[PDB]
Structure 1
Amino acid sequence: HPALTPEQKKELSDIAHRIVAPGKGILAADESTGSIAKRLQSIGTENTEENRRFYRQLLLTADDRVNPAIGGVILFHETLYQKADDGRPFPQVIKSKGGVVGIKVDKGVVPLAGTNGETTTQGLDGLSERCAQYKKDGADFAKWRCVLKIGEHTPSALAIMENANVLARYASICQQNGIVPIVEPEILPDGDHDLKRCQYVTEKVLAAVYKALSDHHIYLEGTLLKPNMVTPGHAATQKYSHEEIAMATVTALRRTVPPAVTGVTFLSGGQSEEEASINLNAINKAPLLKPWALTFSYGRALQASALKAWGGKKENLKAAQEEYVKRALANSLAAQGKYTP
């Protein structure tokens, strides 16, 4: 009972490949009102709609040097319906610079009773009609984030099962409406676990993910995967080289991610702008066969300096945009293993 027709499969596949074409990556500017609020706070800027619009504008309209580097940009509901000073709808700006428009459809995480502070995420209700509308309004791909944390007894079996399953429902509903789903099963770096531990959990989680995607009949060629890189915990005692985490990362992926998956867009999760870039570069230089595109889907790792260089002053637009264009170009190079800090 084919879940998708050949025509639909092709549309999803084309979209997926376009997003991660050589040297291209994703700009994750989908911070919700609460998330972006923290951001604006860190630079004494009031969290108003106009301030948010101006900030998203600031990033979405950087000069054309960023064009070949940005294959896609994820937007939050609000932004998708905002406009730039020139009146053009943001989705149009993004599309005019050669990027695909992405929309976050998840409605945050919720607590999983009976577990040690673990979560699952919501947002499935009326998701189909939502995707159909987002499709009409310019979006071609979506993003749904699930969160797992490494600890004594985590991720628990329940956590792994339920989060993999919900990611599948999400992907299924998306592809039904011609939207390429970015499956994001992020494993928080929090904790003091070492490299091996992370590579272990990542492998188990990733395996549970694709089995789910399979049970739910999802078309892998029309998907993208936004995982955490394999790294030691933020509070880990041991120290590792970029080569090591690049090796642990590509290895973990080589034994869980089917080659049909069009591409992997790494989340920087806490890494510094420079760090995320160096690692992405090491990953593409890893002495192992990589059957899928290995690029970026960065949020802070792309907006850090820019936000800081903006400080909320309109007179800083240029200086701020330059920071973003700087990181975007750096990461575009890392996606090809040619980044030379």
Structure 2
Amino acid sequence: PHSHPALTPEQKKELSDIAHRIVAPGKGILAADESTGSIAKRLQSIGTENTEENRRFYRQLLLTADDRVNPCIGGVILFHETLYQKADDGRPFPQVIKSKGGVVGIKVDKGVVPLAGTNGETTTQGLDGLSERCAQYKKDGADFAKWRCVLKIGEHTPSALAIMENANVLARYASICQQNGIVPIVEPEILPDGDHDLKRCQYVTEKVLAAVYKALSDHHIYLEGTLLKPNMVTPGHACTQKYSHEEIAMATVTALRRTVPPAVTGVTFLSGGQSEEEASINLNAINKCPLLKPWALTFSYGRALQASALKAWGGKKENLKAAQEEYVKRALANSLACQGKYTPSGQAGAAASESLFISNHAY
């Protein structure tokens, strides 16, 4: 019943300020924090040996895209290795990012681990020595971090244990970060795996997020100094029923409206398997959703921003500009999407301002 301020007004100001710059109007996040083992699959996808040099070159390719991306990228999430690499001109990658108006982020979790006694569920590790790591990352250029928890929709999942444990570890991570001037991106990803429908995903997302925010409160987390990175609300990959982008958007915004306090500075959606186009189209529908949204609704895309670029590159320096052009096009596409004015391929009429309510009580 007694307060013991976790943060001073100055510390709050800094975190809030960082949080806002990242999701400023028209801006989103480039999630380029793939771990060595995760990026291996990407490189092998284009037949390229997973060496530090190729990774460095690939990250350079994205980080050094022309100034057209500047207004589209509020932040860039990097994997440890990349935070300490430099471009050809000798400039540290963090310097490259900042010179283009982007805030530098660092992934800090150490991957998922299995939860004994559950049906293949997990929690995430990475808290050991996290305070020291955050202080070091801060000194070396990072202003925000990312920690990913993973939940699965199944017959008996996500279980009460999985929900409770992942929410709690996310809160511990958030607390440590804020203690070190680092804005924590809270990512409670609910996988799209399965044949469940849209209603099921919405229900689970609502329950997971309510658990997440209660844990953040219990751990005295300063919400204005945080960002949420959730899954959009969609049917499972194996669901035979079909939905429009407008219904996906309605279910997503409805779920967020019932669980995310207005104080949360922004929601940066993960793309989780959606194609570049789909991810952009859904984000657009979300921002055009009639309902009131008290927070920025933007992106924190990995594959949805890199797919075509990685392919165009093919691991050949020769394809440098061709590759960057693909990334640039998706950056521009999603910048408009987070503003509610994106239209795939060709379309007449620029801003795409319109309205309509679909049922709204059916969710």
Shorter-normalised TM-score: what interval?
over 0.9
1:337 equivalenced with 2:356 (yes/no): no
1:306 equivalenced with 2:309 (yes/no): yes
Structure 1 CA distance for aligned equivalents of residues 117 and 179 of structure 2: 34
**Residue 340 of structure 1, CA deviation:** 1.2
Structure 1 residues not aligned, in runs of 5+:
none
Once the two structures are superposed, residues 276-322 of structure 1 have per-residue CA deviations (whole angstroms, 9 ceiling, x without a partner) of 00000000000100000000000000000000000011000000000
**Residue 146 of structure 1, CA deviation:** 0.1
TM norm structure 1: 1.00
Structure 2 CA distance for aligned equivalents of residues 312 and 50 of structure 1: 11
| CA RMSD, 1 decimal | 0.2
Once the two structures are superposed, residues 206-255 of structure 1 have per-residue CA deviations (whole angstroms, 9 ceiling, x without a partner) of 00000000000000000000000000000001000000000000000000
TM norm structure 2: 0.94
The count of corresponding residues between Structure 1 and Structure 2 is 341
2:216 to 196, 213, 218: 213
Structure 2 CA distance for aligned equivalents of residues 211 and 317 of structure 1: 46
Structure 2 residues not aligned, in runs of 5+:
345-363
Once the two structures are superposed, residues 316-340 of structure 1 have per-residue CA deviations (whole angstroms, 9 ceiling, x without a partner) of 0000000000000000000000001
1:120 to 120, 123, 132: 123
**Residue 85 of structure 1, CA deviation:** 0.1
Q: What secondary structure is seen at the aligned counterpart in 2 of 1:68?
A: coil
1:249 to 248, 252, 262: 252
Structure 2 CA distance for aligned equivalents of residues 7 and 228 of structure 1: 32
Structure 2 CA distance for aligned equivalents of residues 22 and 133 of structure 1: 30
Aligned to 1:283: 286
Q: What secondary structure is seen at the aligned counterpart in 2 of 1:65?
A: coil
Q: What secondary structure is seen at the aligned counterpart in 1 of 2:143?
A: strand
Once the two structures are superposed, residues 92-121 of structure 1 have per-residue CA deviations (whole angstroms, 9 ceiling, x without a partner) of 000000000000000000000000000000
Structure 1 CA distance for aligned equivalents of residues 179 and 99 of structure 2: 26
Q: What secondary structure is seen at the aligned counterpart in 2 of 1:184?
A: strand
Q: What secondary structure is seen at the aligned counterpart in 1 of 2:70?
A: helix
- Equivalences for 1:1-341 in 2 at 5 Å? 1-341=4-344
Once the two structures are superposed, residues 163-193 of structure 1 have per-residue CA deviations (whole angstroms, 9 ceiling, x without a partner) of 0000000000000000000000000000000
Structure 1 runs (4+) deviating above 4 angstroms are none
Structure 2 CA distance for aligned equivalents of residues 179 and 313 of structure 1: 36
Structure 2 CA distance for aligned equivalents of residues 32 and 325 of structure 1: 23
Identity %: 99
Structure 2 CA distance for aligned equivalents of residues 26 and 313 of structure 1: 26
**Residue 158 of structure 1, CA deviation:** 0.1
**Residue 136 of structure 1, CA deviation:** 0.2
Structure 2 CA distance for aligned equivalents of residues 168 and 317 of structure 1: 41
Q: What secondary structure is seen at the aligned counterpart in 2 of 1:101?
A: strand
Structure 1 CA distance for aligned equivalents of residues 201 and 274 of structure 2: 15
Q: What secondary structure is seen at the aligned counterpart in 1 of 2:156?
A: coil
Once the two structures are superposed, residues 56-79 of structure 1 have per-residue CA deviations (whole angstroms, 9 ceiling, x without a partner) of 000000000000000000000000
